Amino acid sequence: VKAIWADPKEVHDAGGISVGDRWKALANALNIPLDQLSARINANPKGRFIYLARQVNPDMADYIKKLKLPGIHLREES
Amino acid sequence: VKAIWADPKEVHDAGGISVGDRWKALANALNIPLDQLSARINANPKGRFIYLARQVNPDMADYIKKLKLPGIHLREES
């Protein structure tokens, strides 16, 4: 017989309880169906780096950064 | 002007891209509205321990464990 407990800090550090809304927001912003986005990210689950988009203008890139999605990163190009 | 990349291991470790379906599943398993589950978890995001349920049957507990939700734990009662 078990007790169930939550560690709110851990939920937060994984992106929050509603992080799903933000995954959808990433997909919509990039106009990549969520299923396609997920498939590409999950293809090699132990992988540490797969490109999503390139030459993304700051307006779209800042928006994506502010979603604060776990495992999502940006770098300058050129 | 940026490249956007994913880290598939960080994404998996956080519970995955479709974690939202499973947070909904947790709320259902606990027989509570998702909004109430969200409100309790969001109450203090730096908090480390809140009880979600007590004296939970072995099978229900195993279902919860298999949702693989970040920050959700089981402990044995006595």
Residue numbers in the entry:
A (entry chain A), B (entry chain C): 88 to 165
What is written in the article reporting this PDB entry?
The penicillin-binding proteins (PBPs) synthesize and remodel the cell wall peptidoglycan, a major component of the bacterial cell wall that gives the cell its shape and rigidity. In E. coli, PBP3 (FtsI) is an essential protein of the divisome, catalyzing peptide cross-bridges between the glycan chains of the peptidoglycan. The overall fold of periplasmic PBP3 is bimodular. The C-terminal module is responsible for the transpeptidase activity but no clear function has been assigned yet to the N-terminal module of the construct.
In order to determine its three-dimensional structure, the PBP388–165 domain was produced and its structure solved. The domain crystallizes in P1 with eight molecules in the asymmetric unit. The eight molecules in the asymmetric unit are organized in four pairs with, in each pair, 18 N-terminal residues swapping into the paired molecule. The swapped residues represent a two-turn helix and a β-strand that inserts between two β-strands of the other molecule to form a three stranded β-sheet. Interactions between the two molecules are numerous and include many hydrogen bonds, salt bridges (e.g. for associated chains A and C: Asp94A-Arg135C, Glu97A-His160C), hydrophobic clusters (Ile91A is surrounded by seven leucines or isoleucines from chain C), and an aromatic ring stacking (Trp92A is sandwiched between Phe136C and His160C). DLS and SLS experiments carried out on a solution of PBP388–165 suggested a dimer in solution.
